[PDB]
Amino acid sequence: DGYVVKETIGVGSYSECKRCVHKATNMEYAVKVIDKSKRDPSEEIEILLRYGQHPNIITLKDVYDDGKHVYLVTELMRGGELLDKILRQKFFSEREASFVLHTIGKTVEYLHSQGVVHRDLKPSNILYVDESGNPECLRICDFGFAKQLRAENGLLMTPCYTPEVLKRQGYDEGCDIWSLGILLYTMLAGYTPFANGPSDTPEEILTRIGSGKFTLSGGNWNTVSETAKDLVSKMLHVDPHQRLTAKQVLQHPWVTQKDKLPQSQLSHQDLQLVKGAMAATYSALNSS
């Protein structure tokens, strides 16, 4: 139960994530410390326990609860965040972008098919496990705001088995797809579609989202495939119920036919501007 707690990795609401190194074998891991009084991580643990073995989902190693705090010990994400790699020291083109979406898209398709929605698919919740930058090293993380589809009696249910009760998933699923849509945009454009920097205001961003318009022309978009633009447009459609499903995304020419994709380095703005814009976009969304 006692580890070797060291540096703090990140921070969050009612939870802190530090770098433990123990297992009585100097084995490095990550441990999320949730305040039992502040928050109840019932849904999160059950999701990680049931779906952690997925290779592109963060695997759960140990779990502890003394009553005051919970200790979710997971595999350590040494590769950092997705943007921290692709927009720094890694050759990134529509080809590499397609592999990234492919990897994450299948994971979401799996989760949606099991009736699990994430509802927090920000690029800071997608991390490499090692510093290779390889697609298979990707891991979806932080299932804090994730919800399993349950029955009236409280039994886990799939959308296959399962009117307005299901349309809730259809919305919640459509928001996960929309979250991937801005990541696709950001990957292609090198900048957030509804934010120009870290100091954008909720009033600015939410107006742009509601307008249902974004730049698919000018800048990087002049040297980007029409299939790449077709996908983002369909992924970021205004009505969440008219957006693509995770399956329909993966059946798209951009994703499937990777031979036809350009392999030229993509331009990007400073990482901190892009990271700044992105965190501000999700900050504006949390208000509404």
Swiss-Prot record:
Keyword list, A-Z: ATP-binding, Cell cycle, Cytoplasm, Host-virus interaction, Kinase, Magnesium, Metal-binding, Nucleotide-binding, Nucleus, Phosphoprotein, Repeat, Serine/threonine-protein kinase, Stress response, Transferase
Residues forming the catalytic site: D120 (proton acceptor)
GO cellular component term, pick one: cytoplasm
Post-translational modification: N-terminal myristoylation results in an activated kinase in the absence of added growth factors.
Protein's UniProt keywords contain Nucleotide-binding: yes
Gene Ontology molecular functions: ATP binding; magnesium ion binding; protein serine kinase activity; protein serine/threonine kinase activity; protein serine/threonine/tyrosine kinase activity; ribosomal protein S6 kinase activity
Protein kinase domain residues: 3-255
Binding residues annotated for ATP, in chain numbering: I9, G10, V11, G12, S13, Y14, S15, E16, C17, K32
Keyword check for Cell cycle: yes
Biological process per Gene Ontology, one example term: negative regulation of TOR signaling
Function comment: Serine/threonine-protein kinase that acts downstream of ERK (MAPK1/ERK2 and MAPK3/ERK1) signaling and mediates mitogenic and stress-induced activation of the transcription factors CREB1, ETV1/ER81 and NR4A1/NUR77, regulates translation through RPS6 and EIF4B phosphorylation, and mediates cellular proliferation, survival, and differentiation by modulating mTOR signaling and repressing pro-apoptotic function of BAD and DAPK1. In fibroblast, is required for EGF-stimulated phosphorylation of CREB1, which results in the subsequent transcriptional activation of several immediate-early genes.
Protein name: Ribosomal protein S6 kinase alpha-1
Species of provenance: Homo sapiens (Human)
Section covered of the full-length record: 416 to 708 of 735
